[PDB]
Structure formats: structure tokens, C-alpha cells
Design a protein around this nucleic acid. Structure first.
Ligand SMILES: [Mg+2]
Ligand SMILES: [Mg+2]
Ligand SMILES: [Mg+2]
Ligand SMILES: [Mg+2]
Ligand SMILES: [Mg+2]
Ligand SMILES: [Mg+2]
Ligand SMILES: [Mg+2]
Ligand SMILES: [Mg+2]
Ligand SMILES: [Mg+2]
Ligand SMILES: [Mg+2]
Ligand SMILES: [Mg+2]
Ligand SMILES: [Mg+2]
Ligand SMILES: [Mg+2]
Ligand SMILES: [Mg+2]
Ligand SMILES: [Mg+2]
Ligand SMILES: [Mg+2]
Ligand SMILES: [Mg+2]
Ligand SMILES: [Mg+2]
Ligand SMILES: [Mg+2]
Ligand SMILES: [Mg+2]
Ligand SMILES: [Mg+2]
Ligand SMILES: [Mg+2]
Ligand SMILES: [Mg+2]
Ligand SMILES: [Mg+2]
Ligand SMILES: [Mg+2]
Ligand SMILES: [Mg+2]
Ligand SMILES: [Mg+2]
Ligand SMILES: [Mg+2]
Ligand SMILES: [Mg+2]
Ligand SMILES: [Mg+2]
Ligand SMILES: [Mg+2]
Ligand SMILES: [Mg+2]
Ligand SMILES: [Mg+2]
Ligand SMILES: [Mg+2]
Ligand SMILES: [Mg+2]
Ligand SMILES: [Mg+2]
Ligand SMILES: [Mg+2]
Ligand SMILES: [Mg+2]
Ligand SMILES: [Mg+2]
Ligand SMILES: [Mg+2]
Ligand SMILES: [Mg+2]
Ligand SMILES: [Mg+2]
Ligand SMILES: [Mg+2]
Ligand SMILES: [Mg+2]
Ligand SMILES: [Mg+2]
Ligand SMILES: [Mg+2]
Ligand SMILES: [Mg+2]
Ligand SMILES: [Mg+2]
Ligand SMILES: [Mg+2]
Ligand SMILES: [Mg+2]
Ligand SMILES: [Mg+2]
Ligand SMILES: [Mg+2]
Ligand SMILES: [Mg+2]
Ligand SMILES: [Mg+2]
Ligand SMILES: [Mg+2]
Ligand SMILES: [Mg+2]
Ligand SMILES: [Mg+2]
Ligand SMILES: [Mg+2]
Ligand SMILES: [Mg+2]
Ligand SMILES: [Mg+2]
Ligand SMILES: [Mg+2]
Ligand SMILES: [Mg+2]
Ligand SMILES: [Mg+2]
Ligand SMILES: [Mg+2]
Ligand SMILES: [Mg+2]
Ligand SMILES: [Mg+2]
Ligand SMILES: [Mg+2]
Ligand SMILES: [Mg+2]
Ligand SMILES: [Mg+2]
Ligand SMILES: [Mg+2]
Ligand SMILES: [Mg+2]
Ligand SMILES: [Mg+2]
Ligand SMILES: [Mg+2]
Ligand SMILES: [Mg+2]
Ligand SMILES: [Mg+2]
Ligand SMILES: [Mg+2]
Ligand SMILES: [Mg+2]
Ligand SMILES: [Mg+2]
Ligand SMILES: [Mg+2]
Ligand SMILES: [Mg+2]
Ligand SMILES: [Mg+2]
Ligand SMILES: [Mg+2]
Ligand SMILES: [Mg+2]
Ligand SMILES: [Mg+2]
Ligand SMILES: [Mg+2]
Ligand SMILES: [Mg+2]
Ligand SMILES: [Mg+2]
Ligand SMILES: [Mg+2]
Ligand SMILES: [Mg+2]
Lengths: 199, 66, 87
RNA sequence: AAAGAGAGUUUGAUCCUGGCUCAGGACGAACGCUGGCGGCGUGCCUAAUACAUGCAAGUCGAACGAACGGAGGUCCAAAGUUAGUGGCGGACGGGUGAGUAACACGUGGGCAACCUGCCUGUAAGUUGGGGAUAACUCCGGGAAACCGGGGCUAAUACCGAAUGAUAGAGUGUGGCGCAUGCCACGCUCUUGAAAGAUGGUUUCGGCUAUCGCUUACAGAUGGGCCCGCGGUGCAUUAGCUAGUUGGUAGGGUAAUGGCCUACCAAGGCAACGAUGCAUAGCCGACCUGAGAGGGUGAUCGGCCACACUGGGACUGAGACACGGCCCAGACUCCUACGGGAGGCAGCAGUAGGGAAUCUUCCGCAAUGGACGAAAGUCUGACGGAGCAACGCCGCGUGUAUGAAGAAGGUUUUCGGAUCGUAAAGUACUGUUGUUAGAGAAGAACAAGGAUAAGAGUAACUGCUUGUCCCUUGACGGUAUCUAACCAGAAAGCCACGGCUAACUACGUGCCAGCAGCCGCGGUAAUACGUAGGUGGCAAGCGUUGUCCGGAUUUAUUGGGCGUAAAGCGCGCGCAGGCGGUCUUUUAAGUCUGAUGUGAAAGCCCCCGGCUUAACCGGGGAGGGUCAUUGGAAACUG
């Protein structure tokens, strides 16, 4: 991926349990390093905006320049800026693979997309940043097929969001309709990232 | 300089291997401490040498990775 | 005055414009009036042409090239030009 | 629909004014540390400095000079597929930005004041003669570029003749305009043309097909000239000019014009900036900005100028001509000392200047050029390959699990915390990579053979169109695809007191040093060096140089002049700016409709094509105090 370091470190510093359910924050919820269990300090507006940017960036696991380019392209759309930015972030192939049950984290989905183990409309895709559209399907092209990892991922995969429909008999998933901000993270404040990029 | 300009430059870093009639590479940037000095010297781009025993800010002072 | 074929696009990916221009001008330089498109990469060739300004230029003395002649023949401009000359 | 962020710094503390500095974006960039790959682009910004070496413009035997098989005479050999004169092209294509402040460029017009090879169409004609000349061969001068003389011969080479002007004059008729003048037609006289070559048929004479040549008329194309408006600094640059200003005649050019000449009068331009000095190619456009504006002219497209410096002309439809000619000048080279040759701001490449920029590569396969009837030749245009993290976009260095927590660093209030699920273990994959194989598009053709139908013909041959048969790849075994192995072969830079995200210990002690500013360093340093930790970015990260923003810090949008910088000491007044009330009239300003135009590429919107993106394609929109013209009359005139 972009970054192969420890995953509990970034979540502990950020304050939220991204890519999991509190299991990274079960113990010592303070920031990493030797400082953070000792004391804290004040937070300014710049700190809050940077924190929200990090929330998004390390939640979706994509680099900074591509993040800003996606924000700029989302600005081209019509509607509220942050909502469009988030919903275009939700169009990522990695996000669809992860939330569809074929994996468990963002890293697993990214690697499983890099090797081409999935396919859209019978076309092998090695691009994690591929933007899925309405009616596009996914599959496994019988590469992993009877693989232990995908079976385990489908076992422990919570549930499926209502904006995507997936059946496990043929491992087929497709976007029902466009997701809304209502069915999204909501641990973040999307109103601050636009201001942060506005300075 | 290349245009015959009397230019007073500053030597950064700890220690240097500079002397008279030596080729030096002058770079922009003035220091407020000296009333006349207005330019810096790049370390490691010409006859000028780097700085020994440097671990931090190694890109400047012209020291390679140890 | 020739109804020429101008090349643009990208490396190893050419696309062509059927355009009329003078023989003394650069291939990608000054021209008079573009009339069509020509795409070679697709196995079935997609050629769009006005078929009305082309006949006017042919009447006025615009000699085409070999491939432009082939395209006008396949699209029927040459046969209609012969019919107009007869009629 | 669009619609603008601030912080530090003068004081013992304040509030204003004001400057300085910083937080962002962009480069044809450079330097330092570092460095895995793929796609698309860019690369002498300085010396328009000087140039080794090779290649960049040649082509036509259908107008006049080859070896073989081989008629003929065991021996030599006749006819059958290959230099130059002549025609076309060299004025295109390609490169630089020196010069130029002007009709050079942008935009919009005018030419009743113009030209134009090749291309297309039409109307007529291609009828008869002559004298030569290269090539070739002898005689000489020759160091050599090469010079002269004698003899000989062709043509689509050259020069007269028959005939033919919408060319000159003279006239008439009719219709007309924007003053000069334009158009249709008629009459008399005087001048101006040609060339043939490859076939077919016929009788062989003839006739005929294709390509050719002469004249005239239109179209298309490319140029020429004139004009309104528009885009820089200095007034510590105020007068400049004399073929200048106008006229009368003339010469010259494709054309108007002091473009040039003789004569006549003394004019003309200028504070609405003449003249002069300095810098600079212009535009579409690029960077920034909320916008108005500000800066620039990298890549690409259009126009202009130049080709070692300065001047000139010939040939040609088109040149005062990059790889053509003559003269002078500087430089390089050869010489037998009399004299000769050269011009990379063409593609590669060398030396020098620089902080700084690439191979002395492949091919005409595709597109386009020149020649030819065609095959075909040439094409450093162009299509491609090589180098440089120079820029944009894309992907990787693994993934899940793994503990009160391996081992060991950093600290410890020496109980512990921290690196940290990070490790080992555990289960899995091969995007990259290695090994072995299958492997495209870009290709349309041109020509050649059959056809079918037309025009033309007495008939053909041929011509135009349509349908088939056969042939053509530098890239290149390239993209791509298929299988086996592998967590192994792949992470660095800057920063951490505030501006601004992120702290502990040790060493040093106004020293070493840091620094954009506030300023830190004199023994308890979160600012100096190192170690641990943390933050940002990522095959990149920092520093410097230039531009815009922040800067309302030239304020039209959008500031001011009592005391902070800022009201002339006052008056009279030319030019200029502004102007009480009402009516009628005009449409200069103002507002609006229609026509033409503001090239392509670029920004923007919608669709698509490359596995996505960058990138590419289609359509649309935007942009003017623009020309023609029709409207309204409140306001300014
Ligand atoms: Mg430092
Ligand atoms: Mg062709
Ligand atoms: Mg918008
Ligand atoms: Mg500051
Ligand atoms: Mg900004
Ligand atoms: Mg570098
Ligand atoms: Mg290195
Ligand atoms: Mg790359
Ligand atoms: Mg240059
Ligand atoms: Mg010859
Ligand atoms: Mg040119
Ligand atoms: Mg230029
Ligand atoms: Mg004769
Ligand atoms: Mg003779
Ligand atoms: Mg003779
Ligand atoms: Mg006559
Ligand atoms: Mg007559
Ligand atoms: Mg008129
Ligand atoms: Mg007559
Ligand atoms: Mg005659
Ligand atoms: Mg012919
Ligand atoms: Mg001929
Ligand atoms: Mg302009
Ligand atoms: Mg300008
Ligand atoms: Mg005259
Ligand atoms: Mg200049
Ligand atoms: Mg650009
Ligand atoms: Mg502004
Ligand atoms: Mg530019
Ligand atoms: Mg250039
Ligand atoms: Mg240009
Ligand atoms: Mg030159
Ligand atoms: Mg030179
Ligand atoms: Mg002439
Ligand atoms: Mg030339
Ligand atoms: Mg040359
Ligand atoms: Mg060159
Ligand atoms: Mg050199
Ligand atoms: Mg070619
Ligand atoms: Mg060709
Ligand atoms: Mg050649
Ligand atoms: Mg080239
Ligand atoms: Mg090329
Ligand atoms: Mg470079
Ligand atoms: Mg790059
Ligand atoms: Mg990248
Ligand atoms: Mg590794
Ligand atoms: Mg591992
Ligand atoms: Mg693991
Ligand atoms: Mg210890
Ligand atoms: Mg791990
Ligand atoms: Mg093997
Ligand atoms: Mg093979
Ligand atoms: Mg292979
Ligand atoms: Mg035929
Ligand atoms: Mg045929
Ligand atoms: Mg066929
Ligand atoms: Mg055949
Ligand atoms: Mg064949
Ligand atoms: Mg060919
Ligand atoms: Mg080959
Ligand atoms: Mg090969
Ligand atoms: Mg391959
Ligand atoms: Mg194997
Ligand atoms: Mg092995
Ligand atoms: Mg391997
Ligand atoms: Mg393995
Ligand atoms: Mg590994
Ligand atoms: Mg690496
Ligand atoms: Mg320090
Ligand atoms: Mg460290
Ligand atoms: Mg770090
Ligand atoms: Mg301003
Ligand atoms: Mg003020
Ligand atoms: Mg006042
Ligand atoms: Mg005062
Ligand atoms: Mg007063
Ligand atoms: Mg005063
Ligand atoms: Mg007064
Ligand atoms: Mg007045
Ligand atoms: Mg009034
Ligand atoms: Mg346009
Ligand atoms: Mg372009
Ligand atoms: Mg697409
Ligand atoms: Mg584009
Ligand atoms: Mg487009
Ligand atoms: Mg378009
Ligand atoms: Mg628009
Ligand atoms: Mg009135």
C-alpha cells in the first residue's frame, strides 16, 4: 500500500477507531510516543481542521496528492461540496471491495485489487482507485475461488450497506444507488476540511 | 564572482576547508548578524567540503548518509 | 488545393482529420476548411464526412489523395461526382 | 451561477498611523541528501560566440551516348532491360528572435488602383521555314579551381512567316455609379501563337486515344497596396522637418502614390507629447488573482524579420533568394607566390561562456512533399528508438492473525512507561521481479489482371465510375496474454518555543553555533550538536532565484490631506472639466433585433475512447467601446 506501518498507532493518535471497532483503542487511548500518557495541550482551529483531514485520509487509505485531486474534481459537481467529496470517496474500488465483504480492512482490499483477483464486467482491474458506477458488477474470476482468506473475510464481515447489493453464491456485488451522507462515517466533521483547503 | 564583484559571503557549519584562491559556490540568503554579509556558501557543490559528524539536517552542509 | 489528411492524437495512437488545404503548407499547419474525421485503430473504419462541401471542392478543383479517394469512393462521393459530371 | 481567512514586531502598559517579515500557488529552473517501475510530455533561458565529421533537394530515356543471351562471320560479334544538354523543382519544407516603437502585429474594412505557375471548367488552335550549339574530337595555357582556338551533330533548345485580340487609337448605341468612372454590344484600321512524344485502328494515305504546347474567359488558391481603432519608460528629451508640404507636366511599376525628375508657392507635424534617448519580435495564449487587474511570450498554431558583416543585380509566375551569383570587410584553409575554396541561427556532434541542459541511432511501413504516364528516386519533414525523477498521472516495498506485551534501545519519581501487534510464530497473494512460452491494431493502398456500365467515336486503343484477385511493417517478438517460484531483490528528506502540525535526556557554556521575524547561547537550553520519540510529505524531500497573492502598500472596483506623510502665501484669468427650469426637433452618446466575422489548439459544460488517471476524440459555450442595417427617445450632447 502507500504506508505499511503500525495501524494502532495512527488510530491512537487520531482519537477514533478507524478500520475497526474500538479494538485498537481498548487500552491506553492516549497518543503514541512517550508523551501523551503524561499530559496534553490546547487545540486551535488549524489543529481541528488538520485532524479532520487526517480522519478522512487515513480512513480511506489514499495518499495526500490524490486526496486533493479528488477534492478538486468533486468541486466540479453540483451540490454541497463536502457531501460530494465524501460520496466520491465512497466510489473507490477498494472501499467497495472492503464494504462488500470480500475483505476485512482497507489494506486487504487494496492488495486483493492490486493482484487482479477481482473483475468488473469481466475485465481484470489492477487499479484500486477505479471509480465504480451504477450497475457495475464485481467477481473473483475463479483466481482465489476456493481460497481460505476470502471465506474468512465473508465470515466476519458485519453486514452489507443498503446502497450495495451482494450475493455470495457467485461473489457478485453491485451498487444499488448513490449513497448519502446519512449512511456514512459520521465520526468526522466534513464542514472543516473544505475550510482547511480554503486557506 | 563571475562578473568581478566584491562579494562578502558567510560560511555555515562547523569547521571548513576554505582558503585563498579557492573556487566557491555562492548562494542567496542574508544574515542579520553581520552588517555587510548578504550571501551564503553551499557546502559540497564545489571545492568547498562538507561538515564532519552530521546526523541531522544532513541534506544541507553536504554530508552523505553514513 | 488538396483535401488532405491531418494527423494528431498521441504516440502510437493516431487520429486523422479530412481537411482541405494547400500543398505548400505544413501538414499540421494552416488549412482552409476541415470536413471530416478518420479513425484507423478500430477494425471497422469510422469515417464521417460532410458529403456536400466535399462535392463543391471537387467541382472547384480540389484533387484528393489516394486514401482520401478510397474513402470518398466507399462513401459514394466519387460515384456521385461522376454522375453529376454526366448529368 | 459566482462571491475575498490572517500572524509577529515601536510602549511601563494602551488605541491609531506606518513600514518590515512570514504562512499559499507556479517554473524551459539550479544546488544538497536520496532513489523501484509504467504511461504522457519537456530539455542552451548565457556567446545572432567559433565550428571538426557524416547526412539534410533532387527528379524525368515517352526529346539526343550500357553488360549479357544472342543474327551473322572453329574464332570475333549486328539488334533487345541503366551518364550529360533540355523541362520541372530548388521561393516549399526546416532553424533562430539579432534588428524593428512601425500599418511589424491584433481586429474591421477598401482596391471603379492590382498580380497569380501548378489545379478545375469552357471556347478556338497546334499550319509552314531557317541558322546554330553543347555532348564528341584535335591544338595549346596549365600546380590546381579550370580556361581559350579549330572541326562535327540533335531536339519539347533558339529565331522569322501564314492566321487569330475583349492589346492601342478612332469612334457609335444602350444601361449605370462612389468624384476619378463601371457594364453589355457594334464599326474601321495596326500589331501579337504554338511542339511534339508514347500507342490504336486503318490502306499504308487518313482517322483516333493519353500526356503535352499557344491565346482568351471564369472559379479556386497564394500574394501586393491603402485605411479607422488597440497594446512601453523618460519632459532632469521642446521644438522637428526642406522631396519636406501641395500643385502643374513627365518618367517608372502588376497597380495608386514626391516612388523618382523639372517647374511653381512655403508649407507640414507637435503639451490629444512632435523630435530624441532606453528597452523590446507581435498575437492566440501561460502564471496568479474573489474580480477588476498584475507579470511573462517556455512547448504548440498564425504573422513578421534574419541567414558571418555591408551593398547589388540576373533567372523565374513568385527571390533582391539559409544549404544560388557579383563586390568590399574580418576570419579559416591550399599554393608551384601567378592565384583559388568556405560559411551548422538544418539534423546529430566538438571547443568556449554558464549554476545549468541530450545519441555523431532506425525507416520511408503510415501522413505529407518534389519529379514521372507509371513502376520508382529523394525527403535528419515525419513516423520511431536512446539519455536526463525535468513535470503530470498511475502502481509497488507485502496481507490477516499474533501479548499486560518476545528480546533490546530511550528514559525512570529506577514500581514503571515507551518504541508496540511493531516482532518471532502463524495462514495467504504475486501487482512488481526471475524462468519458459504464445503475440496484435497501426495496412489504406499505389501499380498489375479480370470485369460491368458511361462519354467519345466509322471502329477501336485509351479515359471515368463500380465489383473482385495478388502484394506491402523501422517500431517489433513491441504492447498484450499464459504458466511455475518468491516475503523474499525495493524508503528517504525536512521539522518539533510562537507564527505552524509535533518533546525528553545527554554535551557545551555569549564559546561552539542557529536564524524568515520575535530573537536564543553567560551551569537546570523543549531554539546550539547528538540520541530516543513525534509531526508532514513520499521516490521524492529541502535550499536558492523570478512572478502573483496576502498588500486597501497607487485604493475605478477599494485610501486619504486640523494635530501621524499629505491644501500651493494670495489673486486675475487662456485651454480644459462641470453646469438652473420648460417645450419642439435630431439619434452623436445611450439601450435593443437581425447579417457577417472574432482560425485551429487552450479554460469551461455535456458525451465518449485508452483496465483508471494523466492523455486523446466529438459536440457545445465563452470572448469585440468589431463592420452593414432596422428599431425606442427617459437621460448626457
Ligand atoms: Mg536544526
Ligand atoms: Mg496516401
Ligand atoms: Mg462553482
Ligand atoms: Mg514573521
Ligand atoms: Mg489563495
Ligand atoms: Mg536534482
Ligand atoms: Mg544517490
Ligand atoms: Mg515513471
Ligand atoms: Mg538562443
Ligand atoms: Mg542522365
Ligand atoms: Mg517558414
Ligand atoms: Mg518568437
Ligand atoms: Mg529548324
Ligand atoms: Mg544545324
Ligand atoms: Mg549541325
Ligand atoms: Mg491578324
Ligand atoms: Mg474584334
Ligand atoms: Mg461602386
Ligand atoms: Mg465587334
Ligand atoms: Mg507573327
Ligand atoms: Mg497521362
Ligand atoms: Mg510530357
Ligand atoms: Mg493583449
Ligand atoms: Mg503584452
Ligand atoms: Mg502621375
Ligand atoms: Mg532584442
Ligand atoms: Mg501549462
Ligand atoms: Mg487580491
Ligand atoms: Mg509563455
Ligand atoms: Mg526556444
Ligand atoms: Mg510561435
Ligand atoms: Mg545561418
Ligand atoms: Mg555564427
Ligand atoms: Mg524577370
Ligand atoms: Mg534555398
Ligand atoms: Mg548552413
Ligand atoms: Mg544543430
Ligand atoms: Mg561542453
Ligand atoms: Mg514517405
Ligand atoms: Mg507519399
Ligand atoms: Mg540525398
Ligand atoms: Mg526531428
Ligand atoms: Mg521525431
Ligand atoms: Mg535536465
Ligand atoms: Mg517524473
Ligand atoms: Mg507519485
Ligand atoms: Mg523490505
Ligand atoms: Mg511481514
Ligand atoms: Mg504480518
Ligand atoms: Mg535501559
Ligand atoms: Mg505487522
Ligand atoms: Mg526457470
Ligand atoms: Mg515465442
Ligand atoms: Mg519473453
Ligand atoms: Mg476502370
Ligand atoms: Mg477497376
Ligand atoms: Mg479482398
Ligand atoms: Mg490474382
Ligand atoms: Mg504480387
Ligand atoms: Mg507503398
Ligand atoms: Mg528489424
Ligand atoms: Mg528483437
Ligand atoms: Mg510481454
Ligand atoms: Mg519454477
Ligand atoms: Mg525459490
Ligand atoms: Mg521473485
Ligand atoms: Mg510466496
Ligand atoms: Mg517481504
Ligand atoms: Mg527504495
Ligand atoms: Mg536542537
Ligand atoms: Mg530521529
Ligand atoms: Mg517520521
Ligand atoms: Mg493591489
Ligand atoms: Mg492611507
Ligand atoms: Mg478636503
Ligand atoms: Mg504634518
Ligand atoms: Mg491657506
Ligand atoms: Mg506648507
Ligand atoms: Mg491660490
Ligand atoms: Mg474652459
Ligand atoms: Mg442640463
Ligand atoms: Mg476557438
Ligand atoms: Mg496547437
Ligand atoms: Mg472512461
Ligand atoms: Mg484537455
Ligand atoms: Mg476537445
Ligand atoms: Mg472541440
Ligand atoms: Mg462556456
Ligand atoms: Mg425631448
Amino acid at each position: 500500500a502507500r504506508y505499511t506501518g503500525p495501524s494502532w498507532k495512527v488510530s491512537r493518535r487520531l482519537g477514533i477507531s478507524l478500520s475497526g471497532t474500538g479494538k485498537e483503542l481498548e487500552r491506553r487511548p492516549y497518543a503514541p510516543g512517550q508523551h501523551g500518557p503524561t499530559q496534553r495541550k490546547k487545540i486551535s482551529e488549524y489543529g481541528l481542521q488538520q485532524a479532520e483531514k487526517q480522519k478522512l485520509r487515513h480512513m480511506y487509505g489514499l495518499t495526500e496528492r490524490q486526496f486533493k485531486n479528488t477534492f478538486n474534481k468533486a468541486g466540479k459537481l453540483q451540490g454541497k461540496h463536502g457531501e460530494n467529496f465524501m460520496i466520491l470517496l465512497e466510489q473507490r474500488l477498494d472501499n467497495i471491495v472492503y464494504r462488500l465483504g470480500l475483505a476485512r480492512t482497507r489494506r486487504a482490499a487494496r492488495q486483493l485489487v492490486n493482484h487482479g483477483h477481482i473483475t468488473v464486467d469481466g475485465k481484470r482491474v489492477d487499479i484500486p482507485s477505479y471509480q465504480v458506477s451504477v450497475g457495475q458488477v464485481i467477481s473473483v474470476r475463479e483466481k482465489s475461488a476456493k481460497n481460505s482468506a476470502i471465506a474468512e473475510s465473508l465470515e466476519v464481515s458485519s453486514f452489507v450497506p443498503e446502497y450495495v447489493t451482494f450475493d455470495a453464491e457467485t461473489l457478485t456485488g453491485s451498487l444499488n444507488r448513490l449513497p448519502e451522507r446519512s449512511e456514512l462515517a459520521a465520526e468526522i466533521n466534513e464542514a472543516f476540511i473544505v475550510e482547511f483547503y480554503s486557506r | 564572482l563571475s562578473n568581478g564583484i566584491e562579494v562578502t559571503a558567510y560560511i555555515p557549519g562547523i569547521g571548513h576547508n576554505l582558503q585563498e584562491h579557492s573556487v566557491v559556490l555562492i548562494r542567496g540568503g542574508r544574515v542579520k548578524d553581520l552588517p555587510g554579509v548578504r550571501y551564503h556558501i553551499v557546502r559540497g557543490a564545489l571545492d568547498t567540503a562538507g561538515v564532519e559528524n552530521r546526523g541531522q539536517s544532513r541534506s544541507k552542509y553536504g554530508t552523505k548518509k553514513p | 488545393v488538396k483535401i488532405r489528411l491531418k494527423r494528431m492524437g498521441s504516440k502510437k495512437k493516431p487520429f486523422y482529420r479530412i481537411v482541405v488545404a494547400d500543398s505548400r503548407f505544413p501538414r499540421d499547419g494552416r488549412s482552409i476548411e476541415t470536413i471530416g474525421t478518420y479513425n484507423p485503430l478500430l477494425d471497422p473504419v469510422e469515417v464521417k464526412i460532410d458529403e456536400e462541401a466535399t462535392l463543391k471542392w471537387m467541382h472547384n478543383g480540389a484533387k484528393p489523395s489516394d486514401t482520401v479517394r478510397n474513402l470518398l469512393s466507399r462513401e459514394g462521393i466519387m460515384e456521385k461526382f461522376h454522375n453529376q459530371k454526366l448529368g
